[PDB]
Design a binder for these strands. Sequence first.
RNA 1: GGAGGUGGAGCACGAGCGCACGUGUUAGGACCCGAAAGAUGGUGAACUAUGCCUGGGCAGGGCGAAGCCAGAGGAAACUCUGGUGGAGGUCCGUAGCGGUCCUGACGUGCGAAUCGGUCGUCCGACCUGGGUAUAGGGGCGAAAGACUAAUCGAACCAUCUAGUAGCUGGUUCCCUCCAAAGUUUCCCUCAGGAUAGCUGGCGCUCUCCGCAGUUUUAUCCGGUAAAGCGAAUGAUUAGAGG
RNA 2: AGCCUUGAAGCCUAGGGCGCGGGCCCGGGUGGAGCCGCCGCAGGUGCAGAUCUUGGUGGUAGUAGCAAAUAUUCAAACGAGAACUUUGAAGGCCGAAGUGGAGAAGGGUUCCAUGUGAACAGCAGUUGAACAUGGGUCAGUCGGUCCUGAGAGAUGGGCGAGCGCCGUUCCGAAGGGACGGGCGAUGGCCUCCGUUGCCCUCAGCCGAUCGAAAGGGAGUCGGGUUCAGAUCCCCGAAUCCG
RNA 3: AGUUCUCUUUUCUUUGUGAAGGGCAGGGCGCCCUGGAAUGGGUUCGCCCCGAGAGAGGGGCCCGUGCCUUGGAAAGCGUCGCGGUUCCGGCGGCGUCCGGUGAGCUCUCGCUGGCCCUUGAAAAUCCGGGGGAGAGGGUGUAAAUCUCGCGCCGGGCCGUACCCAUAUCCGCAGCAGGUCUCCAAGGUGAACAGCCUCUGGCAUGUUGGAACAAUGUAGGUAAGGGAAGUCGGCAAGCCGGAUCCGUAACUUCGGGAUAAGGAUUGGCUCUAAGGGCUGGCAGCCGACUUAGAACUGGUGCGGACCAGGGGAAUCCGACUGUUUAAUUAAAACAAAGCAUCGCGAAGGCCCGCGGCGGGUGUUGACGCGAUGUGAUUUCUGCCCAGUGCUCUGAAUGUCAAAGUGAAGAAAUUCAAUGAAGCGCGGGUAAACGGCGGGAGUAACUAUGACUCUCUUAAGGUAGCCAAAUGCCUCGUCAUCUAAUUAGUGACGCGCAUGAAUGGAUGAACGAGAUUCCCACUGUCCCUACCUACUAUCCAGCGAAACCACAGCCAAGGGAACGGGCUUGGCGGAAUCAGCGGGGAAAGAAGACCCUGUUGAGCUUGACUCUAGUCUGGCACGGUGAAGAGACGUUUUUUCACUGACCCGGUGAGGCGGGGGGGCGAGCCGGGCUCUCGCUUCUGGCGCCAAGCGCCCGGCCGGCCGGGCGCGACCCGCUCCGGGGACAGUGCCAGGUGGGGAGUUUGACUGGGGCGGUACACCUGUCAAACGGUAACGCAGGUGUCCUAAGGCGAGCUCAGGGAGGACAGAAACCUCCCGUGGAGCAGAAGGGCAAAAGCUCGCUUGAUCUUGAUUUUCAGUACGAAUACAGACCGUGAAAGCGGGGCCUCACGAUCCUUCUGACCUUUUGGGUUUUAAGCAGGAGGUGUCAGAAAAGUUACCACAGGGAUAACUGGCUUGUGGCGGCCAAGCGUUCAUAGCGACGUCGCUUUUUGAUCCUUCGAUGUCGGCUCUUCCUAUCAUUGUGAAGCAGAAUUCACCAAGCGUUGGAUUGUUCACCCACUAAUAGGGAACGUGAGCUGGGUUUAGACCGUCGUGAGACAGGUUAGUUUUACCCUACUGAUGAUGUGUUGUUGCCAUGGUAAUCCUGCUCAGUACGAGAGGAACCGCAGGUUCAGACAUUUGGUGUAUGUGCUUGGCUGAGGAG
Length: 248
Amino acid sequence: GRVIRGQRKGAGSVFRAHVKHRKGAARLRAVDFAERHGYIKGIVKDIIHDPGRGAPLAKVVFRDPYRFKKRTELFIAAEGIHTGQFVYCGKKAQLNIGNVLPVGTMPEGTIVCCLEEKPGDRGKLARASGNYATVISHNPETKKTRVKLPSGSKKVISSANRAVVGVVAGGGRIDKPILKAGRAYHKYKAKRNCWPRVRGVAMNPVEHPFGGGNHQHIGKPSTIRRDAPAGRKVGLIAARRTGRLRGT
RNA sequence: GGAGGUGGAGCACGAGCGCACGUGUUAGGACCCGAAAGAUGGUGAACUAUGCCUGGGCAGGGCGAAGCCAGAGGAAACUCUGGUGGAGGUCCGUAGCGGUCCUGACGUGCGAAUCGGUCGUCCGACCUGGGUAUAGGGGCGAAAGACUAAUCGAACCAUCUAGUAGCUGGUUCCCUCCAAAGUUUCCCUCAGGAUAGCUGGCGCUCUCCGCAGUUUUAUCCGGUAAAGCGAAUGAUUAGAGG
RNA sequence: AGCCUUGAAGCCUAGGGCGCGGGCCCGGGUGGAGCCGCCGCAGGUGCAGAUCUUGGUGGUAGUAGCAAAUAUUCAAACGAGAACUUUGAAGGCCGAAGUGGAGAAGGGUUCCAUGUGAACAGCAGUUGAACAUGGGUCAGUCGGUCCUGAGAGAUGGGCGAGCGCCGUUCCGAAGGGACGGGCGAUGGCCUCCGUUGCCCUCAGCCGAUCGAAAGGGAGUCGGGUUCAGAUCCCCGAAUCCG
RNA sequence: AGUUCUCUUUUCUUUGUGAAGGGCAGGGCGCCCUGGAAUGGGUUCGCCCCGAGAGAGGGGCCCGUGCCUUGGAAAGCGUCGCGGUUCCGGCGGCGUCCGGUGAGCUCUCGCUGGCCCUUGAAAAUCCGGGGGAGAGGGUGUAAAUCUCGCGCCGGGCCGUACCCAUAUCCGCAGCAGGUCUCCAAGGUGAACAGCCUCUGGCAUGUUGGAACAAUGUAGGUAAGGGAAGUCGGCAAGCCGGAUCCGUAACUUCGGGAUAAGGAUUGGCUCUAAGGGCUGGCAGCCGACUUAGAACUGGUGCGGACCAGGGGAAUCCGACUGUUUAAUUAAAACAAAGCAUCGCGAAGGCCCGCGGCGGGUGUUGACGCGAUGUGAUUUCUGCCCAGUGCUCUGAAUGUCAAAGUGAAGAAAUUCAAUGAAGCGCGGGUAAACGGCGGGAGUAACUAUGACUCUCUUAAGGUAGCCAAAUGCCUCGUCAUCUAAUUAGUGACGCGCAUGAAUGGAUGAACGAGAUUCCCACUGUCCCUACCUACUAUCCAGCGAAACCACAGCCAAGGGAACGGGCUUGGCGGAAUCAGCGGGGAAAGAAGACCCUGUUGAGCUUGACUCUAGUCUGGCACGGUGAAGAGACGUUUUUUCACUGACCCGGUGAGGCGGGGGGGCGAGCCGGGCUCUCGCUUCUGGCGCCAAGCGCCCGGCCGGCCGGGCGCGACCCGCUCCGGGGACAGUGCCAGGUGGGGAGUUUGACUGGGGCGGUACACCUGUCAAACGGUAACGCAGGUGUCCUAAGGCGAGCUCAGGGAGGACAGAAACCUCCCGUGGAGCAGAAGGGCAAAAGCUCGCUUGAUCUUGAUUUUCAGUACGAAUACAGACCGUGAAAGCGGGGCCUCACGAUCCUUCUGACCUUUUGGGUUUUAAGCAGGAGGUGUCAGAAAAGUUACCACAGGGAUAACUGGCUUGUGGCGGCCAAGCGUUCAUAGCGACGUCGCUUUUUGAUCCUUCGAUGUCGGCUCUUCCUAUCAUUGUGAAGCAGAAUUCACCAAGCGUUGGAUUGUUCACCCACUAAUAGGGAACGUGAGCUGGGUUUAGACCGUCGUGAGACAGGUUAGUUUUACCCUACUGAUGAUGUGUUGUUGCCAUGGUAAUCCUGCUCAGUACGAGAGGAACCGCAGGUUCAGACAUUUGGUGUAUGUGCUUGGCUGAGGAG
Ligand SMILES: [Mg+2]
Ligand SMILES: [Mg+2]
Ligand SMILES: [Mg+2]
Ligand SMILES: [Mg+2]
Ligand SMILES: [Mg+2]
Ligand SMILES: [Mg+2]
Ligand SMILES: [Mg+2]
Ligand SMILES: [Mg+2]
Ligand SMILES: [Mg+2]
Ligand SMILES: [Mg+2]
Ligand SMILES: [Mg+2]
Ligand SMILES: [Mg+2]
Ligand SMILES: [Mg+2]
Ligand SMILES: [Mg+2]
Ligand SMILES: [Mg+2]
Ligand SMILES: [Mg+2]
Ligand SMILES: [Mg+2]
Ligand SMILES: [Mg+2]
Ligand SMILES: [Mg+2]
Ligand SMILES: [Mg+2]
Ligand SMILES: [Mg+2]
Ligand SMILES: [Mg+2]
Ligand SMILES: [Mg+2]
Ligand SMILES: [Mg+2]
Ligand SMILES: [Mg+2]
Ligand SMILES: [Mg+2]
Ligand SMILES: [Mg+2]
Ligand SMILES: [Mg+2]
Ligand SMILES: [Mg+2]
Ligand SMILES: [Mg+2]
Ligand SMILES: [Mg+2]
Ligand SMILES: [Mg+2]
Ligand SMILES: [Mg+2]
Ligand SMILES: [Mg+2]
Ligand SMILES: [Mg+2]
Ligand SMILES: [Mg+2]
Ligand SMILES: [Mg+2]
Ligand SMILES: [Mg+2]
Ligand SMILES: [Mg+2]
Ligand SMILES: [Mg+2]
Ligand SMILES: [Mg+2]
Ligand SMILES: [Mg+2]
Ligand SMILES: [Mg+2]
Ligand SMILES: [Mg+2]
Ligand SMILES: [Mg+2]
Ligand SMILES: [Mg+2]
Ligand SMILES: [Mg+2]
Ligand SMILES: [Mg+2]
Ligand SMILES: [Mg+2]
Ligand SMILES: [Mg+2]
Ligand SMILES: [Mg+2]
Ligand SMILES: [Mg+2]
Ligand SMILES: [Mg+2]
Ligand SMILES: [Mg+2]
Ligand SMILES: [Mg+2]
Ligand SMILES: [Mg+2]
Ligand SMILES: [Mg+2]
Ligand SMILES: [Mg+2]
Ligand SMILES: [Mg+2]
Ligand SMILES: [Mg+2]
Ligand SMILES: [Mg+2]
Ligand SMILES: [Mg+2]
Ligand SMILES: [Mg+2]
Ligand SMILES: [Mg+2]
Ligand SMILES: [Mg+2]
Ligand SMILES: [Mg+2]
Ligand SMILES: [Mg+2]
Ligand SMILES: [Mg+2]
Ligand SMILES: [Mg+2]
Ligand SMILES: [Mg+2]
Ligand SMILES: [Mg+2]
Ligand SMILES: [Mg+2]
Ligand SMILES: [Mg+2]
Ligand SMILES: [Mg+2]
Ligand SMILES: [Mg+2]
Ligand SMILES: [Mg+2]
Ligand SMILES: [Mg+2]
Ligand SMILES: [Mg+2]
Ligand SMILES: [Mg+2]
Ligand SMILES: [Mg+2]
Ligand SMILES: [Mg+2]
Ligand SMILES: [Mg+2]
Ligand SMILES: [Mg+2]
Ligand SMILES: [Mg+2]
Ligand SMILES: [Mg+2]
Ligand SMILES: [Mg+2]
Ligand SMILES: [Mg+2]
Ligand SMILES: [Mg+2]
Ligand SMILES: [Mg+2]
Ligand SMILES: [Mg+2]
Ligand SMILES: [Mg+2]
Ligand SMILES: [Mg+2]
Ligand SMILES: [Mg+2]
Ligand SMILES: [Mg+2]
Ligand SMILES: [Mg+2]
């Protein structure tokens, strides 16, 4: 057989991300003395559409505490922030939508977005439009916090991780039917070469495990073990169950 | 050390070595020509496939979404009527792009895919130039095993390589003499080999008793043809007397 | 002590013969320089075939054919020669999505003048994009040149038997610059200023480089002019940059 | 300048001003000031705007490509007129003028809106602003400075022609192909449509002349009919623009929709309405439109061009979109929607030989990655047994290396321990998939709600169906027709329907499949005519395919279909136009089929591996506390540490500790518990130090200028965080591993496959009286069994029968008699056997050890089996003897390797001892394909070498079967065998059935059916002439001579076949390579795409359905059709003969005979005559019809010649 499409996606080539018109990587501020010990002020200059991303991005301007300069940051825009608003980042910022605070200082039940996976990484969790994490509890002895992620998993993270108060803007996006293949053509023309998707059973056995046959059938179970070699790991990968999810 | 059996490619008064010529068998390109393949290293995205960058392009009509204006009705909710408006992977249809049927033309063509009428679509998942990216068990594929320079169910180039072929084709002067086999056994043996038989050549040991695809005379051997079933085995018809 | 310019090989021949045959001898002609008998040696040594190789030639056969896109005619000229060339006049066609006028890619002299009519232009030609002999492309302002794009690609580093490969800010002492100030040295319109060396002071760019004759990118227009060049030459009037 | 016969103050051409600067229109402003607005107002085609300031006034700015002006009239152009060397930017006159209009077209500038789960580059480069470090002069000879106006100098290098495409480029070429752009006139018209014209261009596309035959290619037209044609309406035809009217089912309310169906349309002359400017009015200007009316023509008018046929349904797919470049455009693919699955980053998925490598990722679960289904609507049932996937694990079977323990001289052996994985247990079907059988039963019959029973993991639920899925099958009923293998609607024990392997539906849509209806027609009945280009003939020019030699037939035989050969018929130069019978014509070493110890693509439960991946050990690999062990050391568990190692951030910018200061608490002002480090209202600003303290320099306490410190705490060893002795990496070991690699996937065989085993053996037969002897010949057996069923000895005698004896009988046991084996001897059969070879006892291990010879198969090899001996040991018997397996004929296995037994055995390499190892001899472990490879599929995506050794056509032999025909005569026929039939039997013929066979063809003979066309057979349906009937007539039946002439139109089906409708004299049957594809067609079959069912894990398969799928060449020879001609008659002509060859007419209706013969009646003929018709043939055009480019004559659309007229 030949190399299957899933195998070919890894080599880059025609499967690389379309990043020509993107505005930059969205991140928090790099952690420095002001955020470690106090707060720093910023002003929301603009809120912009980012090609390929559902959530809007906010362009925030800070003062440089060591040089006569203005620093432009590119944040995930929490819902409800507006241009000309002041946002504040640091240990002693106040609990307001759009401010950046360590999760250790936030009371239980706070709703946050663009949360750091590790202290200082500048925001990695709950960045998709409409999403957010929640604060469950703190352990000041171990200096750690328990948060609930948009997938529903609960994670233990360092209390020093920063986050933005509120939920990401642009929520409810998936509630609209696309209605058109052409509208899905445009959705992914901004993202990457992944659309449309041809089915495994619709190919020949040379390019897919499910291909071939005088009937379009899988022929073999579609739940494939976790350790199957690349080019065989297709279908339901390491599925714990299958069928209709009935119940809780 | 003896006697008596038995295994040896031995001894029993050498015959070898060297050189040359022929014939045969074989290892080598191996009598000559012939695969589908496999391997190594390289050249191609000027066609085409797909992503990206930067440019160009797409008459005239039909239908008439939301929004809005006015008049009418109504207790309210709101309803009705006439206009305005100009949406759409919307419709007819040009350029363009494509290529349904005639199973039309042509079929040593104009053409290694073209031509005519008729047809699909024609603001979009649209058409297109150049730039750039992906290279051969690799790419790329809205998926036909499609496309990847007239090459694709694995490109092209050189080499390995005069690849192997129990298989097809061919195999070049004269006269003279002799002259077959298609059968036995073994073989992943059944289009092939080895093996015995059948042939030829070289002789040599004798001769001018031996032998014989023959009969004769003796002497054995045999269970077929025929015959038999009022003889065994098997099969089978009719009466008769007890 | 072979043959041969008093004629070798080769070739041709309704000439005379020999041999069962393979073949050979002699005669005549052409030819123009070498060749053969016998004893031995050696072999890339004998063709009718292989859809054999290469070259040549037939019949087919003066045959298929020279039928896509409406169309030609009259007179004159040159000339050996005219259905096809030139001029004039008619009749037609393309019918501004052109059979018009200009470019890009590609070609590379095909462009222009004169000459030829051998070959080629599937009839002909007095004609041609053929052949021959000579010419023709002029820029601060139109492009390239510069920028970066998708991307490509060195160094540091890493990997690698190795040619090398990965990688493009990532494991890097990555600045050879500057207003100014202070110490000197040299010169000149020697008055005092330049230049120049060192020290002090100041200093993010953070990625060499390549990448578009359609993207970004200052500034040229009118008239005339040649066989062929012109927003380039000449005339006139301007303008950007330094 | 054109026209002017007539008219036309006419028609045509032409009638400029660059850049840059200045000015002014015009356009735009989300710009300013006054002011304060509801009775809200302003305002656009739409919008939209306002107390966050509308209207109204007055300003400002930006673009001004428009106009004026300098440029600049000097130039250019038009026209007229003069000169020259006359190849002069030659010189002169005049002119280059005044207005209108527009949803017009093209370009551009601007305003305003809509669309996006799409938001639509970067950089070089240039500019403005904020700040104020600095500099400049001291009132002048002014300075620093100036983005102002002039002036001065320079701008190097490379490209530049021309073509730019029915002849400059790529397709071998001047190739009907391909190849990116810019400008873009008048008329008609909605129009960049088509048609005509101007500017510009061209010469008909690599030649001309003359004809006007066939057959073509491309256009047309056809009376009457109207799909009867054909697989199928293929093709053509109909409709078509616009206005006015009108418009159904169904529907997702958007559509359907140009539904369907009507009417109108020309020309001319008018009427009305629809506006602008200046000053309810007046005047002056204007742009095309709409509506209405009269008149008018031979009812013609969207007059050319342009330009939808329609309706009722069924299947499939929602749609738009895409696709096999070059045979498949589709129902296939995609799609939105739906549902699953993995993953929280040291991660999921993937790349990569390699790493601190790479893609997703400029990403973060509303995400990325992997699958299935396929819009909406409605629903999606049961099954976790199987196969997968997944989850739990010291509780725990197996389990590698390493490590631990014991034995030993050690090698080594043994033991304990026990990672993953497997086993074990849960979950899971929108994972792959799956979802029964029998019997009885309701008061007629039928069904059978109901019951019993076997049964699996469920036993097919809702639905749906002869569906693209049902074999039987052309299912049954109904509808559609005259007639229907078609369609539709129902039915449903459904070979083999069914629920995201999605079931059912349903609007809109479709170059998708199918049926019917209206309309239309040359598809047809049934063909004809016309036009153009060919073909044709000529001048010029000029190939190629192909070719053993060739080219007339019948039969024969022959490699079974001859051009050649045999026997006959016969044969006459050279040619032209056609033609498609033959040359089993050409084209390509057959793709089908088989064989090959030839492949390749693909699959998997094949064999052997392998990347990756999971898992354990060793190393890098450290520090310290505890817990549990073992004897101060050492193993292990937990908890920590950091310094290796890893990760993240940053321009490595304030880290740890202490000091200093502020608010609180609290003990008797001080000490501490302990916390804090100066920014949160506003879409400002924020650096390059102020201040203070202390030193220093230069000049005259005063000026000028420097340095340090505090401001800005001190000390520190990793920049700051996060991990961390683990990730990870290196090397080993176990598991997984069609993701990938290589390879295999027997043979025989009346083709192969399936089936068998005739593959190694044995008995009887074949087998033809020695032996041998074949077939997928016939009847059978074999892979064992036996401590005795081996060996010896003795003693007995068996099967069966007769007759007797308590229970006792057909059969128990006892007795006598007969008994040649009719029993038994393990088994298949054949042979053999009676004081034995059988049965029963006693004793035994000759079934032991050993060398040779021989026999059988045979090559005179091996094995196996067997035969005589010889040497030992033995058994048995009194002994002779007999016995080294079974009474005989079968019962079995090389080399290499392993294992055992044997010797005071040999070797173990410099010697010696000892373990080990190797030798030598004999057994065993096994190859059954049995003289002995280690081995699964599929290919319709397929390949090569061959094969007529071998299948799929024809032909050939045969003729079982099929068909047809006799003979006998029991019967039938009321009677009566034979008018007509005919059993039980039996003899033939035929090659239009199917077989059987494999002779020809696999370097190819085109595979069904139809169409068309000719010919032949007779086994006769009709017709002519006849014979016989159970022949009264009529009708019918049987038979004879007999193939002259006929044997038809249709519905369903691809059909051959079949069936039905209808007409008819009749509706006979057949051959010609199952006649006929260089004759067609291509419906079926039979490539590649795709769907369904059944089957398969799968790739894939299916004499099962379904849909779409390239049909090549003639100019050669012959034959045939026509056309010139040839011989020789001296030449030449006219008129003739006819040898030979062809050959043709056919059948039916009416009237009359005649309501007659005949007959009870009912019914009901015939000959002769008369009048017509059918089929066929040969002509013909007076008539009717068709054609019509006489391009004949009217009419007419658009354009063109100024108009008329003529065109
Ligand atoms: Mg595979
Ligand atoms: Mg496919
Ligand atoms: Mg020999
Ligand atoms: Mg060779
Ligand atoms: Mg040899
Ligand atoms: Mg190989
Ligand atoms: Mg390209
Ligand atoms: Mg459309
Ligand atoms: Mg359309
Ligand atoms: Mg065709
Ligand atoms: Mg042709
Ligand atoms: Mg690759
Ligand atoms: Mg396929
Ligand atoms: Mg070769
Ligand atoms: Mg062979
Ligand atoms: Mg063998
Ligand atoms: Mg052979
Ligand atoms: Mg016998
Ligand atoms: Mg006999
Ligand atoms: Mg001669
Ligand atoms: Mg010479
Ligand atoms: Mg030689
Ligand atoms: Mg030769
Ligand atoms: Mg030769
Ligand atoms: Mg000719
Ligand atoms: Mg042109
Ligand atoms: Mg030109
Ligand atoms: Mg010529
Ligand atoms: Mg020229
Ligand atoms: Mg590189
Ligand atoms: Mg550059
Ligand atoms: Mg450029
Ligand atoms: Mg106002
Ligand atoms: Mg003038
Ligand atoms: Mg300032
Ligand atoms: Mg030029
Ligand atoms: Mg012409
Ligand atoms: Mg011409
Ligand atoms: Mg041409
Ligand atoms: Mg031509
Ligand atoms: Mg007609
Ligand atoms: Mg008619
Ligand atoms: Mg019909
Ligand atoms: Mg018919
Ligand atoms: Mg049609
Ligand atoms: Mg309709
Ligand atoms: Mg579709
Ligand atoms: Mg595509
Ligand atoms: Mg195709
Ligand atoms: Mg097609
Ligand atoms: Mg699924
Ligand atoms: Mg299960
Ligand atoms: Mg059911
Ligand atoms: Mg029909
Ligand atoms: Mg039905
Ligand atoms: Mg289900
Ligand atoms: Mg199914
Ligand atoms: Mg000619
Ligand atoms: Mg022949
Ligand atoms: Mg002869
Ligand atoms: Mg023929
Ligand atoms: Mg042929
Ligand atoms: Mg062959
Ligand atoms: Mg072949
Ligand atoms: Mg073989
Ligand atoms: Mg293979
Ligand atoms: Mg291959
Ligand atoms: Mg296996
Ligand atoms: Mg595998
Ligand atoms: Mg494999
Ligand atoms: Mg075989
Ligand atoms: Mg005999
Ligand atoms: Mg005895
Ligand atoms: Mg003995
Ligand atoms: Mg015995
Ligand atoms: Mg061996
Ligand atoms: Mg297939
Ligand atoms: Mg098949
Ligand atoms: Mg046959
Ligand atoms: Mg018969
Ligand atoms: Mg009787
Ligand atoms: Mg044969
Ligand atoms: Mg035979
Ligand atoms: Mg042949
Ligand atoms: Mg033929
Ligand atoms: Mg007869
Ligand atoms: Mg036939
Ligand atoms: Mg034929
Ligand atoms: Mg054909
Ligand atoms: Mg077909
Ligand atoms: Mg097919
Ligand atoms: Mg299945
Ligand atoms: Mg007439
Ligand atoms: Mg007429
Ligand atoms: Mg007129």
